[PDB]
């Protein structure tokens with residue numbers, strides 16, 4: 157307790173010596189409260205909304221632009237049988253992930269190149285992080301903490317709640333220096349991890365789920381966890397920490413300090429309106445950078461799902477206690493079939509799809525519930541409902557269609573309800589957007605649609621309209637996945653590269669010569685997934701689209717524009 161966190165708490169105490177009041181009516185039960193002190197939205201993208209008029213009267217779209225008791229919860233300690241299963245599996249999984257990779261420190265140079273590329277780090281003297289990385293004074297502050305961690309102590313690595321846990325750039329750098337390698341060197345790539353999809357891209361995920369469907373076995377299971385980050389136990393944090401067993405030198409010590417001082421023993425500042433700032437501590441639950449969070453969520457999810465698979469195959473009888481011979485059976489299962497069982501999964505942080513050996517998996521719930529990974533929207537002991545068709549499985553907020561081109565070649569495409577896509581593209585975050593910056597964000601959404609959602613009639617039409625309304629040479633902007641749409645290259649050339657040339661599931665590499673060779677879903681299947689095709693509002697929009705494009709061109713002014721509407725058959729004469 158207070159020996160590891162007290163030094164951080166002491167320093168905050170003094171900075172607000174005038175206001176250090178202990179509010180006896182503090183709402184925390186699970187969080188350990190220390191003291192208080194005195195302290196004191198989604199905007200619409202006008203370019204995308206003017207070019208999607210029919211959606212102005214659809215509440216699922218228009219409500220998206222308008223407008224905890226899970227963090228303050230406790231998770232019971234797992235049984236001894238469960239703790240053994242997790243330790244054996246985690247030991248085995250780090251070794252497997254480490255067979256073709258070498259842990260290493262990430263550099264100030266690498267960090268500095270990420271801040272100048274507008275990468276989301278979650279950071280709180282210096283206005284922006286760019287100024288701080290340029291100032292040696294910042295690196296002087298980083299050095300002091302760096303030497304504190306080598307000494308096994310912490311002073312400034314404190315979380316700020318808002319769920320997102322922002323920290324000071326110095327603590328974020330020290331996290332990146334010690335654990336950035338997991339993402340920077342692609343540990344959770346499909347090639348390395350077999351279950352992972354880090355770096356894949358939305359265009360790949362459907363092909364990956366269809367490859368899992370090809371395995372002999374039972375239903376496809378896709379159970380969501382209720383509040384995954386809140387269910388991470390101190391036992392889970394200990395199993396994650398075993399990556400340090402593969403390290404050496406300074407790196408081993410720096411990594412051991414991140415896990416010990418900032419992950420397994422936290423300090424957090426939360427704003428309570430009654431406005432004051434509360435300084436609370438807790439050892440369990442997930443509270444890290446979003447990028448390290450992603451890789452450790454993937455690791456711990458892979459572990460939990462291999463154990464659920466062991467339970468269904470009868471590898472162990474009870475979570476109460478593993479016998480000596482069950483330990484050897486579990487290790488032997490992992491050595492003999494572990495890699496095959498990893499390939500039966502697609503795991504993206506807390507999100508999973510599993511095609512187990514058979515449907516015994518559906519009712520194998522004792523280890524999953526005892527690890528604290530309780531399923532969302534089903535009773536604790538009711539068996540999981542599986543999917544019989546890979547095209548119906550949810551994964552990473554999508555489902556996937558099999559779409560046959562006029563020339564016979566097969567595309568596997570990502571999809572989701574079209575109201576969600578249009579509603580998201582109509583929102584921008586933050587202040588001080590120029591008309592040009594707003595336009596360039598609309599262009600990013602439009603190019604994303606031409607590449608990923610070209611098969612949805614409304615989105616190919618709206619994408620063509622937005623690209624016709626925004627000056628041809630303006631560069632799309634965006635104030636685990638691949639962003640091929642962020643470019644000024646011709647979108648037909650990018651489509652050919654992504655879906656044909658670089659597609660490992662497409663044997664015939666014949667280029668497509670025009671957008672009219674590129675198919676849509678069935679009219680009925682487009683309506684099922686939210687198309688307005690068939691409505692009078694939509695027909696009038698499509699027919700009069702040049703009027704909408706011209707409205708937006710008149711607002712932006714006398715710039716160079718291209719007409720992309722004749723790429724579609726109906727505007728081709």
Ligand SMILES: Cc1nc(C)c([C@H](C)NC(=O)C(C)C)s1
Nearest residue numbers: 358600601604608634637638639
């Ligand atoms: C299908 C998508 N994949 C990723 C990674 C997206 C990002 C977050 N969003 C964007 O690039 C928008 C500004 C268009 S959308």
Ligand SMILES: [Cl-]
Nearest residue numbers: 543544545548
């Ligand atoms: Cl189904």
Ligand SMILES: [Zn+2]
Nearest residue numbers: 310311312313
């Ligand atoms: Zn620290």
Ligand SMILES: [Zn+2]
Nearest residue numbers: 555571572685
């Ligand atoms: Zn669909």
